[PDB]
Amino acid sequence: SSVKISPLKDSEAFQSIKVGNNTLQTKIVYPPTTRFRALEDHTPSDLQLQYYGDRSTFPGTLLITEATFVSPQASGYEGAAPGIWTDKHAKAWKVITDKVHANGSFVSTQLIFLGRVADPAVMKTRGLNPVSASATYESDAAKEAAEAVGNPVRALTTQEVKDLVYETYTNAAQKAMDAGFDYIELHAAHGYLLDQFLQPCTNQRTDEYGGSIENRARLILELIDHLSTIVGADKIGIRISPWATFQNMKAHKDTVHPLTTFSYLVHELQQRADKGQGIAYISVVEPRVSGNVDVSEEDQAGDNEFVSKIWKGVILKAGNYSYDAPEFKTLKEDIADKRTLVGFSRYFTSNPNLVWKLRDGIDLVPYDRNTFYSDNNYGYNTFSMDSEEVDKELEIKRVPSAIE
Amino acid sequence: SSVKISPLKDSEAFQSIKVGNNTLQTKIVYPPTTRFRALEDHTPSDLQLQYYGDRSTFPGTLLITEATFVSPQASGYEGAAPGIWTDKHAKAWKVITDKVHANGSFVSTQLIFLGRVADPAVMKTRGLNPVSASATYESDAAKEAAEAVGNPVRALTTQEVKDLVYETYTNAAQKAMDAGFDYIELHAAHGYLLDQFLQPCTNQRTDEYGGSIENRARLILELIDHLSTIVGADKIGIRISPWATFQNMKAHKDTVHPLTTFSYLVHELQQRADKGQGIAYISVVEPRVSGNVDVSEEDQAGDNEFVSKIWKGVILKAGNYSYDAPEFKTLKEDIADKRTLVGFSRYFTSNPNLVWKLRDGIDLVPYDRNTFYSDNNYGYNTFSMDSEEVDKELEIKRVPSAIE
Ligand SMILES: Cc1cc2nc3c(=O)[nH]c(=O)nc-3n(C[C@H](O)[C@H](O)[C@H](O)COP(=O)(O)O)c2cc1C
Numbered sequence: 057s058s059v060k061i062s063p064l065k066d067s068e069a070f071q072s073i074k075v076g077n078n079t080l081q082t083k084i085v086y087p088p089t090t091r092f093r094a095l096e097d098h099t100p101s102d103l104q105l106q107y108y109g110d111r112s113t114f115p116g117t118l119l120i121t122e123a124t125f126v127s128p129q130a131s132g133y134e135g136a137a138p139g140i141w142t143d144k145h146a147k148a149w150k151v152i153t154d155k156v157h158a159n160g161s162f163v164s165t166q167l168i169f170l171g172r173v174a175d176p177a178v179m180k181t182r183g184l185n186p187v188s189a190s191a192t193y194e195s196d197a198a199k200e201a202a203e204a205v206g207n208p209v210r211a212l213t214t215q216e217v218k219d220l221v222y223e224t225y226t227n228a229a230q231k232a233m234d235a236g237f238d239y240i241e242l243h244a245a246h247g248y249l250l251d252q253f254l255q256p257c258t259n260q261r262t263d264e265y266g267g268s269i270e271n272r273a274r275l276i277l278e279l280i281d282h283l284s285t286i287v288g289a290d291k292i293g294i295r296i297s298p299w300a301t302f303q304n305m306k307a308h309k310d311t312v313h314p315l316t317t318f319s320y321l322v323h324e325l326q327q328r329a330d331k332g333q334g335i336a337y338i339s340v341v342e343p344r345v346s347g348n349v350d351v352s353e354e355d356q357a358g359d360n361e362f363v364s365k366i367w368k369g370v371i372l373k374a375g376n377y378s379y380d381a382p383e384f385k386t387l388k389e390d391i392a393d394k395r396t397l398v399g400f401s402r403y404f405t406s407n408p409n410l411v412w413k414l415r416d417g418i419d420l421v422p423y424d425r426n427t428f429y430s431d432n433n434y435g436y437n438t439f440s441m442d443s444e445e446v447d448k449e450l451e452i453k454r455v456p457s458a459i460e
Numbered sequence: 461s462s463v464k465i466s467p468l469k470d471s472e473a474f475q476s477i478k479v480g481n482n483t484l485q486t487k488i489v490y491p492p493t494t495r496f497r498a499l500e501d502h503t504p505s506d507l508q509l510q511y512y513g514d515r516s517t518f519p520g521t522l523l524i525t526e527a528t529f530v531s532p533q534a535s536g537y538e539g540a541a542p543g544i545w546t547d548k549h550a551k552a553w554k555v556i557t558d559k560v561h562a563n564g565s566f567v568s569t570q571l572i573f574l575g576r577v578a579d580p581a582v583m584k585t586r587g588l589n590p591v592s593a594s595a596t597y598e599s600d601a602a603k604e605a606a607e608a609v610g611n612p613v614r615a616l617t618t619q620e621v622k623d624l625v626y627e628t629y630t631n632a633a634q635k636a637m638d639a640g641f642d643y644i645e646l647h648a649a650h651g652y653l654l655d656q657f658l659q660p661c662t663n664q665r666t667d668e669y670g671g672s673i674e675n676r677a678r679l680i681l682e683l684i685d686h687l688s689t690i691v692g693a694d695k696i697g698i699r700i701s702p703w704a705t706f707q708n709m710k711a712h713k714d715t716v717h718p719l720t721t722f723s724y725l726v727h728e729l730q731q732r733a734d735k736g737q738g739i740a741y742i743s744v745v746e747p748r749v750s751g752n753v754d755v756s757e758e759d760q761a762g763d764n765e766f767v768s769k770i771w772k773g774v775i776l777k778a779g780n781y782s783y784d785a786p787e788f789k790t791l792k793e794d795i796a797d798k799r800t801l802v803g804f805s806r807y808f809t810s811n812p813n814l815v816w817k818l819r820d821g822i823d824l825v826p827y828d829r830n831t832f833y834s835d836n837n838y839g840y841n842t843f844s845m846d847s848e849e850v851d852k853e854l855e856i857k858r859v860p861s862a863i864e
Pocket residue numbers: 087088089090091122123166243245246295341345347348374375376377399400401402403428429
C-alpha cells in the first residue's frame with residue numbers, strides 16, 4: 057500500500073551539512089542497495105547509469121552505491137554485482153559519478169568483500185577458495201555445498217591479511233578515486249568479511265588479527281589508517297550493523313556482546329578524529345532491520361545510542377524509517393542533533409524522486425520485493441516511467457548493456 | 461497585483477548548466493540589484509548577509525551582487541552602496557559568500573565605477589572629481605550641480621586609464637577573490653563608466669582609448685584580458701545594455717549605432733573564447749527595460765539576437781520576463797538553446813524564494829518600488845517574514861549594522 061507522509065521540507069532534513077569536504081543540501085540518503093544489474097564482468101551498466109542518475113536530482117543528495125567488489129577474491133555472488141578493481145570498472149563508474157555530480161549531488165562507493173558466504177562454485181571458476189578470518193560456514197548447508205564442489209572455506213594467512221590492506225583495498229581505493237567517487241565506504245556489516253573479522257563467532261585466529269577484541273578489530277582499523285593516508289580520512293566511511301543476525305552472526309548471543317565489539321571500534325575511530333584524522337561518517341543499521349530482513353521489537357536486543365554517545369562526527373542511520381509515518385517521529389528525533397543523516401533503501405527503489413516526495417509529503421509508491429534481485433530492467437528503471445508507458449515484456453528482456 | 465504563473469519545473473529552467481567552472485542547477489538568476497543597505501563606509505552589513513542568504517536556498521542558484529564600488533574614485537552615490545577595495549570589505553563579503561556557498565549556490569560580484577554621474581558633492585568630500593572618458597554631463601542640471609560646488613567632471617588622463625586596469629580593477633579583483641566570489645562582473649551597462657568609454661556620445665578622447673569604435677572598446681577589452689590573467693577567464697562576466705537610454709545614453713540615436721558598438725565587443729570576446737580564454741558569461745539587458753525603467757514596445761529600437769548569433773557561450777538575459785506570464789512564452793523561447801540564463805530582479809526583491817515559486821507555479825508577491833532604495837530593513841528583509849509578524853515601525857528603524 058502507498059504510504060501517506062507529512063512534508064519534511066521545514067525540518068532538519070533540509071538543512072545543509074558538511075560531510076568530509078562536501079556539503080549535502082538534504083540529510084536524506086540512498087544507502088547501499090544491491091540490485092544485480094551490473095554487467096557479467098562486473099563493469100557498471102547502462103541501466104545503472106540511469107538508475108543512479110534518476111536518484112540524484114535533488115541537488116546535494118548523497119547516494120551510496122550498492123556493494124561493490126574490491127577484487128576477484130572479494131566476489132562470490134551468482135547475480136551480477138559491480139566491481140571497482142580494474143581500469144574498465146573505474147572508467148564506467150566515472151560516467152555514473154560524472155552524471156550524479158552534474159546534478160550537484162555526491163556519491164560514496166561501498167567496498168564489499170564476501171568472505172565465508174562466497175558461493176563456492178562461483179569462486180571455483182576463478183580458481184579461488186571462499187576465504188575468511190577463520191575456516192567457518194554460516195550453516196551446515198553452506199559447508200556441504202562447498203565440500204561438495206571440493207572448494208571448502210579457508211582461513212586467510214597473516215600475509216594474505218596484509219595483502220588485503222596494501223593490495224586489494226589499496227587498489228580498490230585508487231580505482232574509486234579514478235572513478236570520481238567522493239567517498240569509499242568499508243562494508244563492515246551484515247556478516248561479510250570485515251564483520252567476520254570483528255566478531256568472535258567468525259574469528260578464532262591466533263595471529264595478530266584474532267584472539268581478543270583488540271586483535272579482531274585490528275584489520276578494520278589498519279584499513280582505516282592506511283586508506284586514510286591514500287585518499288584522506290575525509291573521503292572514508294564505514295558501515296556496521298551491531299544488532300544484525302544476517303548470515304548467522306550471533307550478535308547479542310555471541311561470546312562478546314555487540315555493545316562491546318562495536319563501542320570498542322567506534323571509540324577508536326573517535327580517537328583518530330581527536331587527532332585530526334576523523335573519517336567522514338559512520339553508517340549504522342538500526343535494530344528494526346537485520347540485513348534485508350525486518351526485525352520485530354520483541355527481538356530487538358539493543359539500540360545504537362552508544363554510537364551517538366561515543367562518536368562526535370556524522371552518523372548515517374537507516375532501517376524502516378517510515379514505520380511511524382506519516383509523522384516521522386523517530387526520524388525527527390534521530391536527526392535533531394544536527395549531525396545525523398537518515399537513509400531509505402527499499403522506498404528509494406520504487407521512488408527515484410524520494411527526496412522530493414519526502415520534502416513535499418507526496419504519497420510513496422510501494423516497492424516490489426519480487427524485482428529487487430532479478431537480472432533485467434523490469435522493476436528497476438521502470439519506476440522512473442509513467443505507469444502506462446511501460447512495456448513490461450520488453451523491459452523483462454532488457455538486460456544490462458555497456459554504457460553507450 | 462499578484463502574478464499568476466505556470467510551473468517551470470519540467471522546463472529548461474531546471475536543467476543544469478556549467479558556467480565557468482561551476483554548475484548551476486537552475487537557470488533562474490538574481491541579477492545585480494542596488495538596494496543601499498550597506499554600511500556607511502561601504503562594508504557589507506548584517507541586513508545584506510541575510511538578504512543574499514534568503515535567496516540562495518534552491519541549491520545551485522547563481523546570485524549576482526548589487527553594483528559594488530571598485531575603489532574610492534568609483535563611488536558617488538548618496539545612498540550607502542557596498543565596496544570591494546579594502547580587506548574589511550572583503551572579510552565582510554566573505555561571510556556572505558560563505559553563507560551562499562553553504563546552500564550549494566554561487567555568487568558573482570558586479571564591479572561598478574560611476575564615472576560622470578558621480579554626485580559632485582559626495583566626490584568632493586573624498587577630495588576627488590567626478591571622472592569619465594571625456595568631460596561630459598548627463599544633463600545641463602548635472603553640469604550646474606557640479607560647477608556649483610566647484611567640482612566639475614574631468615577626463616581621465618591616459619595614465620589614469622592605465623591605473624584603472626593595473627591598480628583599481630586589479631585590486632578589486634583580488635579583494636573579490638579574498639572575499640570568496642565565484643565571479644567578477646564588469647559593469648559595462650546603463651551609462652556608467654565602462655559604457656561611457658564604449659559609446660561616442662560619452663567618449664570623444666583623442667588618445668588610444670577614443671576616436672574610433674576599436675579605441676573606445678580598448679579599455680574594456682584591456683580589463684577583460686588583464687583580469688583574465690589575474691582570476692582566470694572562467695571567473696569573469698560582463699553586463700551590457702545595448703538599447704538602454706538610462707543616464708542619457710543616446711543608444712540608437714548616437715553617431716554609432718549600438719548594434720555596431722556591441723557586436724564589435726561581443727565578437728572580440730568570442731575570438732578570445734576561440735583562443736581558450738572565453739569568459740564565463742555575457743549579461744545583456746533586454747530592450748523591455750532601460751536601467752530601472754520599463755520601455756514600451758513602440759520605443760524598442762532593436763533586440764539582442766546579435767549576441768546569440770555572435771557569442772557561443774553562456775548568456776544571461778533579464779528584463780520584465782513576467783510580461784507574458786502565466787505561460788512564460790518568451791522566457792521559454794529564450795532558454796531553448798540550452799546556454800541561456802534568465803534573470804529576475806524586481807520580483808526577487810519581494811520573493812526571496814523566487815526560484816521555488818517559479819519552479820512550482822506559486823503566485824508572486826508584488827514588489828514595492830517605494831522601498832527599493834530606502835536606508836532601512838522595511839521592504840528589504842521583511843519579505844522573508846510572515847506578514848503578520850512584521851513590526852513595521854521597528855523595521856523602519858532597523859538600519860544596517862556590522863555583521864555580528
Ligand atoms: C534489495 C536490498 C539490497 C541491499 N543491499 C545492501 C548492500 O549492498 N549493502 C548494505 O550495506 N546494505 C544493503 N541493504 C540493506 C539496506 O542498505 C538497508 O539498510 C535496509 O534495507 C534498511 O533500510 P530500509 O528499511 O529503508 O530498506 C540492502 C537491502 C535491500 C532490501
